[PDB]
Specification:
Elements: E1 3-9, E2 17-23, E3 28-35, E4 41-43, E5 68-78, E6 84-96, E7 99-112, H1 114-118, E8 124-127, H2 144-148, E9 156-160, E10 167-171, E11 184-187, E12 196-204, E13 210-218, E14 225-227, H3 229-236, E15 243-245, E16 250-254, E17 262-266, E18 269-273, E19 279-282, E20 289-292, E21 294-296, E22 303-305, H4 307-310, E23 314-318, E24 324-328
Parallel strand pairs: 3-8, 4-7, 13-22, 14-21
Antiparallel strand pairs: 1-2, 1-10, 2-3, 2-6, 4-8, 5-6, 6-7, 9-10, 9-23, 11-24, 12-13, 12-17, 14-22, 15-16, 16-20, 17-18, 19-20, 23-24
The protein binds 2-[(1R)-1-aminopropyl]phenol (2 copies).
Residues 13, 15, 223-224, 280-281, 283, 291 line the site of one 2-[(1R)-1-aminopropyl]phenol.
Length: 330
């Protein structure tokens, strides 16, 4: 089997991407944030505290003839940005782009943090990291991809995120028309539960490539590119007037600037992020200070190849017995 679903930016800044997901019988379609940095499929629901729901579409398990309460199961998750959610668990039929999993754990939120409430465009998350990170207790549950894997034509999914445009998540096949050149594959460590890999270096604009190992994670659920402070400083030094602002929370730059590209290495291959992809717009409405798309990871503990980096590539998440990642230009 295969599946293919269009993923759409939630706003004009590509803050995140939403993909429609069918849950239950009859189907209830929710728009979920596919997140290769986590491993829970959780949704706003009829059980979510009413004051914490503000415009999201909810899953109502009582209206699904295939929903079953997973007795005794609870979940609770905290994300790298400080947001969180928790609740109980159903199993139900879940379909993405024509690919159907029966008995998928659907984690129903009883509580969500304010950032989730305040964002009406995201109805939940669909985790695509390794199932070892799943938070369901006392019996950990498998991701959608883990449940589908054995049925897929090939045990892979691909992320093809758009810049200011729609894009595609495919399951079970590699669309050879969706990229240019070849796909370069690189080793993955699953020891932390992430799609963790080592970039071979970087360049700023037309500058020389610096060969240096940068360990990080491929994370579709993170908006920006988080890299070591040395790398980030070298990038922003090429933008007149750019500076790190402690009050804003990162590097800002004059909105009148033209940003240089940023290149990262994948083996001997190179993925070029155009300068425009690094512009996150005024820090507040009407400001002439703009927030940068490349930021320091120093306060995270890991480097994160988020959407800024991934949307410059066609990315293969190869879930073979020994997982690997693939990157192609497009
Ligand atoms: C918007 C870019 C375009 N290549 C595309 C993206 C997603 C789905 C269909 C399409 O025609
Ligand atoms: C000024 C941009 C700011 N709202 C932002 C900061 C980090 C990640 C995404 C974002 O859009």
């Amino acid at each position: 089997s295969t599946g293919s679903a269009t993923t759409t930016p939630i706003d004009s800044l590509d803050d995140a991407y939403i993909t429609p997901v069918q849950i239950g019988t009859p189907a209830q379609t929710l728009n979920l944030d596919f997140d290769t940095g986590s491993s829970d499929l959780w949704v706003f629901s009829s059980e979510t505290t009413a004051s914490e729901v503000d415009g999201q579409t909810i899953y109502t398990p009582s209206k699904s003839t295939t929903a079953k309460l997973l007795s005794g199961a609870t979940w609770s998750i905290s994300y790298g940005d400080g947001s969180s959610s928790s609740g109980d668990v159903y199993t139900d039929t879940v379909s993405v782009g024509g690919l159907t999993v029966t008995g998928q754990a659907v984690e129903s939120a009883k509580k969500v943090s304010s950032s989730f409430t305040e964002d009406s465009t995201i109805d939940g998350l669909l985790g695509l990291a390794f199932s070892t990170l799943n938070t369901v207790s006392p019996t950990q549950q498998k991701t959608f991809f883990d449940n589908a894997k054995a049925s897929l034509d090939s045990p892979v999914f691909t992320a093809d995120l758009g810049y200011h445009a729609p894009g595609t998540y495919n399951f079970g096949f590699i669309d050879t028309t969706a990229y240019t050149g070849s796909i370069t594959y690189t080793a993955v460590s699953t020891k932390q539960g992430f799609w963790e890999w080592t970039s071979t270096g970087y360049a700023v604009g037309s500058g020389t490539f610096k060969s240096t190992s940068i360990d990080g994670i491929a994370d579709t659920g993170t908006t920006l590119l988080y890299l070591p402070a040395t790398v980030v400083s070298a990038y922003w030094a090429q933008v007149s007037g750019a500076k790190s602002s402690s009050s804003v929370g990162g590097y800002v730059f004059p909105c009148s600037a033209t940003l240089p590209s940023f290149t990262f290495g994948v083996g001997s291959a190179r993925i070029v992020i155009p300068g425009d992809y690094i512009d996150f717009g005024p820090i507040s409405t009407g400001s002439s200070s703009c927030f940068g798309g490349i930021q320091s990871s120093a306060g995270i503990g890991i480097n994160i190849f988020g959407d800024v980096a991934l949307k410059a590539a066609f990315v293969v998440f190869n879930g073979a017995t020994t997982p690997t990642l693939g990157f192609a230009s497009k």
